[PDB]
Design a protein around this ligand. Structure first.
Ligand SMILES: COc1cccc(CC(=O)Nc2ccon2)c1
Length: 186
């Protein structure tokens, strides 16, 4: 099946807890996969305009590890619940992808999660201005704009709204698309 195939692909890139004990400032993100209309999608947030870092930017749910978290996956799930109302029973964490090093002292660990079909996002307006889906296949043939660095523009055909996706967020989206969609019979 589509979902069994995606999970099998993802597990081959799982680094697990290999880098998780290193003494960094630690953040986790959840890369949430949603199946709609016979295709996989990624769920993105738009950060509230009131936030300190990167107001109004597109990102994945996530945030800083706190002492309550049993592990890095727990960070991702706790923050996702706070931001968009995703409950633990509504997500299956499939793997941990390559972590991202920033600012010399920070390590961001991305987890891919399969999202239940009855989840409906409830954006928390103190943290998130918007939540939207992009088909995973978009990231194989994106609309690129050079700002000089590469930015993706995605237009939602439901309403004509355009979102800009860039940086770590754009890079992780491409990675997930390659992992799941490369070398597939039609
Ligand atoms: C891939 O994008 C990133 C990069 C860095 C940190 C985060 C976590 C985060 O702050 N997500 C939020 C907050 C409010 O809405 N989403 C995500």
């Amino acid at each position: 099946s589509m979902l069994d195939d995606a999970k099998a692909r993802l597990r081959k890139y799982d680094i697990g807890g290999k880098y998780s004990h290193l003494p960094y400032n630690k953040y986790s993100v959840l890369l949430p996969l949603v199946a709609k209309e016979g295709k996989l999608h990624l769920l993105f947030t738009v950060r509230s305009e009131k936030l300190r870092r990167a107001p109004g930017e597109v990102c994945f749910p996530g945030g800083k590890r706190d002492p309550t978290d049993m592990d890095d996956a727990a960070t991702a799930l706790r923050e996702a619940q706070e931001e968009v109302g995703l409950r633990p029973h509504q997500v299956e964490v499939v793997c941990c992808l390559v972590p991202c090093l920033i600012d010399t002292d920070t390590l961001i660990t991305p987890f891919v999660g399969l999202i239940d079909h009855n989840f409906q996002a409830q954006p928390n307006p103190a943290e998130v201005k918007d939540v939207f889906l992009v088909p995973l296949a978009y990231f194989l043939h994106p609309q690129v704009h050079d700002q000089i660095n590469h930015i993706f523009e995605y237009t939602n055909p439901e309403d004509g709204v355009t979102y800009q996706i860039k940086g770590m967020t754009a890079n992780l989206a491409v990675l997930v698309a390659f992992i799941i969609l490369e070398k597939k019979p039609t």
